[PDB]
Amino acid sequence: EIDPKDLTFLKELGTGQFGVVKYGKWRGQYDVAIKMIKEGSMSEDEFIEEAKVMMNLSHEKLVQLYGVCTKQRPIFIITEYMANGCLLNYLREARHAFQTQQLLEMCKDVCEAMEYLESKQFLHRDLAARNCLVNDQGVVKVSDFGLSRYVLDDEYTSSVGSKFPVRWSPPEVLMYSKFSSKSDIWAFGVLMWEIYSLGKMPYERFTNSETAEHIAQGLRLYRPHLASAAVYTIMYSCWHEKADERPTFKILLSNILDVMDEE
Ligand SMILES: CN1CCN(c2ccc(Nc3cc(-c4cccc(N5CCc6cc(C(C)(C)C#N)cc(F)c6C5=O)c4CO)cn(C)c3=O)nc2)CC1
């Protein structure tokens, strides 16, 4: 519970699922992003109840929640500030002319954060390059982890919705609503593909529907040119048709370390 007096609003960063997000200073010194929650976009009381849990989630590679402001409307969510913004856009900028090592570097960051959530048995539910951020050092961090539970948009929270993360979702999710640490693993594999394909949309030639048939038939995403055999094998391991046969984030992290050492 941060006092709003300790906040100054400086510039606009954009708009997300809960509305406008601003850059500004906390306590006149610390860079912050401040979500201004559009009224009616969130289960606000539930989020407030469960926000205490999300504040204990502290990791070098998770976008840190600093505090909330809930004695006013709209409510605020104060978070760590990421200077280079959204990973997806960052990947799509060709001037960066990334080396494959820098790409694997970005995978190791996300995996490190997910490893920690997995230990805390805390599901993201929407892991994708659009939901990851890049700070002034090129470090990638996982953002908005766990906030899917409080969305009040039926285009997002329904399987048939226009905003549902279909292309990041394993078959068991899409057909049965079977959510587990394994559906975060699946999404993580898709995110590794994103990174090595340099921001291409997964199944770029298919609709969401064609994508769901495709993966129910045991068919998967092709190797991005910039992925070696070893890197491709890692993401594909995330996509086993049996959920319980997919690796942990612990195993994936050690997998990534190996290629780093090898290639
Ligand atoms: C010209 N300018 C130059 C500068 N550019 C720039 C530079 C820096 C930044 N830095 C930052 C941008 C954002 C930011 C801004 C707008 C929207 C969102 N999103 C996207 C993901 C998301 C998912 C979900 C769900 C629920 C879907 C999940 N999971 C719910 C949500 F609320 C949101 C959300 O709010 C974010 C990220 O939270 C947050 N933080 C902390 C930054 O540091 N952003 C932009 C912008 C363009």
Rounded to an integer, what distance in angstroms lies between the CA atom of residue 140 and that of residue 124? 16
Number of helices (H), then strands (E), in the chain: 10, 7
For CATH 3.30.200.20, the residue range(s) in the chain are: 1-81
Does residue 202 contact residue 167 with C-beta atoms inside 8 Å? Answer: yes
Sign of CA dihedral 160, 19, 204, 200: negative
SS3 141: strand
Q: What is the largest CA-CA distance in the chain?
A: 56
SS3 152: coil
Going by CA atoms, what residue is nearest to atom 2 of ligand 1? 13
Dihedral angle over CA of 134, 234, 246, 91, nearest 10: 30
Resolution (A): 2.5
User: Which segments within 39-155 are labelled E, that is strand?
Assistant: 65-69, 76-80, 132-134, 140-142
Which atom of ligand 1 lies closest to the CA of 146? 29
Rounded to an integer, what distance in angstroms lies between the CA atom of residue 136 and that of residue 219? 38
Cβ-defined contacts of 63-71 (< 8 Å, 24+)? 63/133, 63/141, 63/142, 63/143, 63/144, 63/145, 66/2, 66/26, 66/30, 66/32, 67/1, 67/2, 68/1, 68/2, 69/1, 69/2, 69/3, 69/4, 69/7, 70/1, 70/44, 71/1
Other Cβ atoms within 10 Å of 204 Cβ, number: 9
- Ligand 1 neighbour 82 (Cβ under 6 A): yes
Question: Which contiguous run of DSSP H or E holds residue 31?
Answer: strand 30-36
Q: Which residues pair with 132 in a beta bridge?
A: 142
For CATH 1.10.510.10, the residue range(s) in the chain are: 82-263
Nearest alpha-carbon partner for 170 in 156, 159, 154, 157? 159
| CA 209 / ligand 1 centre spacing (Å) | 28
Rounded to an integer, what distance in angstroms lies between the CA atom of residue 66 and that of residue 208? 36
Method: X-ray
76: phi > 0 → left, psi -120 to 50 → alpha, else beta; which?
beta
Class of domain 82-263: mainly alpha
Give the distance, in angstroms, between the CA of residue 154 and the centroid of all CA atoms in the same chain.
Answer: 20
Nearest alpha-carbon partner for 200 in 100, 98, 130? 130
Dihedral angle over CA of 50, 55, 56, 59, nearest 10: 130
- Ligand 1 neighbour 85 (Cβ under 6 A): yes
Rounded to an integer, what distance in angstroms lies between the CA atom of residue 56 and that of residue 141? 16
Rounded to an integer, what distance in angstroms lies between the CA atom of residue 17 and that of residue 38? 9
| 114-149: b (≥16 Cβ within 10 Å) or e | bbbbbeeebbbbbbbbbbbbbbeeeebbbbbbbbbe
| CA 133 / ligand 1 centre spacing (Å) | 8
Does residue 31 contact residue 82 with C-beta atoms inside 8 Å? Answer: no
Residues present in the chain in total:
263
Quote the CATH superfamily of domain 1-81: Phosphorylase Kinase; domain 1 (3.30.200.20)
Breaks (C-N over 2.5 A) in the chain follow: none
